[PDB]
Amino acid sequence: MFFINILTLLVPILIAMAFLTLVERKILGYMQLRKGPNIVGPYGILQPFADAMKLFMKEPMRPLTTSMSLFIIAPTLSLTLALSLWVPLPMPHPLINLNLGILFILATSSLSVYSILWSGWASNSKYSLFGALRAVAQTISYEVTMAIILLSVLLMNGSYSLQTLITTQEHMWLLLPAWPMAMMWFISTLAETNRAPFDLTEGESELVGFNVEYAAGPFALFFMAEYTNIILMNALTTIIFLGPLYYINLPELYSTNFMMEALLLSSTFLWIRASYPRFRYDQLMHLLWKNFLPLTLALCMWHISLPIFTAGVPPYM
Amino acid sequence: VRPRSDVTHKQLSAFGEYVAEILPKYVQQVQVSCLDELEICIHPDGVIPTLTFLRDHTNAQFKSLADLTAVDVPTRQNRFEIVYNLLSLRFNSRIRVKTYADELTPIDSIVSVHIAANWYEREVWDMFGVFFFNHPDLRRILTDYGFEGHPFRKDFPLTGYVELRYDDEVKRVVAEPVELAQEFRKFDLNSPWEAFPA
């Protein structure tokens, strides 16, 4: 039965991963006055499966100058961490509820920065190394504010367990309070998934770095990873800040609304991509260290003070 | 028949005399075409001096270099005819200063007078082979890295002498003497009858 549940979480998520790609190629399309992929299958539903098969069949190329492990470990790690982070998520019931759940999600995300570092060193070509170094920096920087923004949340939730927020948000979303950080969580979620406004990790016009030497099966695995993440981080926004209504008698309206909010915020980063030009490498770090980190550290203190003098210290457990 | 204003053919003509007078050491001929265009002609040594006077003279400011080109009249002893076309945004007029250079008698470079010429002078060396002294970095611009011969010279075959194909044996692109599958049909077009006195 546990395996059944393991399958129920991973298989559906992976399929959702696939169709996000399709949805990204139609919502971007209609925004740009074009139908998008509808000719393969009915309305393009078979389109995600089609290139998956093309990608796996095409010859995986191992560059003459390339490590053969820091090359194959990197996509395996990227898919493994991203699919793994869906293990401890309240929907509303988590598969493996962990008392220090949010620290698990923060730690597992942090490990993905390596895959970028390992792939860049493994390729042994200049475009890859330059891209990886800037990339690791972006990801790491957007971790420092990412973590502090969560610590502010937790202090108003009382615990690290993601399951507690379902009881914290039984009367109001944590967006109303703490909206200023939501925005800053959303922008940081956009950076950590290397999506558009912050896609310098792999700029195309700039260094066509992460998958330069990655084609076919390796390309796919990170690829899959990114999109699953795209969902996971959006889903974490939909639990931590937008709290779906929870009724203990019927648990699925929680998941039904979790479904609706996650899809809309997942739709939002698709909409962000088409709408904005990409930021400069330093313009990106200028935002986090200058614009956001002082806002986050100060609002972090406000969230240690709001509890005490408003006699609202949250109940542990 | 095009409309022609003689106001210009007079203005430009006068200027020509003015330039000539101011720079008599180098100006050999100064003509105005029937198309109202002035074309001071200078000894090759006057390249630096004549340009500078035009770039920096209150009564003749010719700030930008429209173009530097070299017609090649093979008959002419001095094969190339370096032509510099300049524009004066202040006086809304253009002038052309043209000099003569043979294959192995280099011309001075004007990169100092106008930095626009940094590239065009490299273009003239690559295509025609004229050399420009004091050029910051003269090196082929348009032709292939290993190209031998100056292409726009009238004595260079259009198709050229080398063409490229990929050879499997050597797994690398390889020049071979040009072998064309339909030679350029050289239609003779000149008519045996003249048009006017000109």
């Binding site: 209609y30 925004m31 006055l33 | 339909q182």
Partner: protein, 178 residues
């Protein structure tokens, strides 16, 4: 007449109201939200794409497309080998050699348009006195092998016979203009 773009006519001194409006613009990304609205708007517009095989992008009569050699209604090929179509071709594409046919008429023994050499200028359409060589409407003649693209008299005459009905309609529509 000139026009300054990006020239600030004067120094509006900050007024709290102004400052707030601005600070709000930086803090709550107001203009960024403006941009998102524009793309959401089109998402709702009808897409302009056409089903390519089923629907075709419109081409009017002068479209040059693919070369064809026409024939008189009687059945006598129009070309009389004056060979100025060869003379005015910019790319040297058309190769024509001729000899007096048995009938005694002038005709081309070999007419070869190298389509890879041709740059579809449409001057040949222009130059022909009998208008034997025409720019036919078809643009879809992509070929697996390079040799197929080279076209001799028989392919062009066959191309002419296949598309004669539309070529005649197209020339009918545009001849007054020429």
């Amino acid at each position: 007449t000139y026009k300054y773009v990006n020239k600030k006519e004067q120094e509006s001194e900050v007024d709290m109201k102004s400052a707030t409006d601005n600070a709000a613009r930086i803090l709550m990304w107001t203009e960024l939200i403006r941009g998102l609205g524009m793309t959401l708007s089109y998402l709702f517009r009808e897409p302009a794409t056409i089903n390519y095989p089923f629907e075709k992008g419109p081409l009017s009569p002068r479209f040059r497309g693919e070369h064809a050699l026409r024939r008189y209604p009687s059945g006598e090929e129009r070309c009389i080998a004056c060979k100025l179509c060869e003379a005015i071709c910019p790319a040297q594409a058309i190769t024509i050699e001729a000899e007096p046919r048995a009938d005694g008429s002038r005709r081309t023994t070999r007419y070869d348009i190298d389509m890879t050499k041709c740059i579809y200028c449409g001057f040949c359409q222009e130059a022909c006195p009998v208008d034997a060589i025409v720019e036919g409407p078809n643009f879809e003649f992509s070929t697996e092998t390079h040799e197929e693209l080279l076209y001799n008299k028989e392919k062009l005459l066959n191309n002419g016979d296949k598309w004669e009905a539309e070529i005649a309609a197209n020339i009918q529509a545009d001849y007054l203009y020429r």
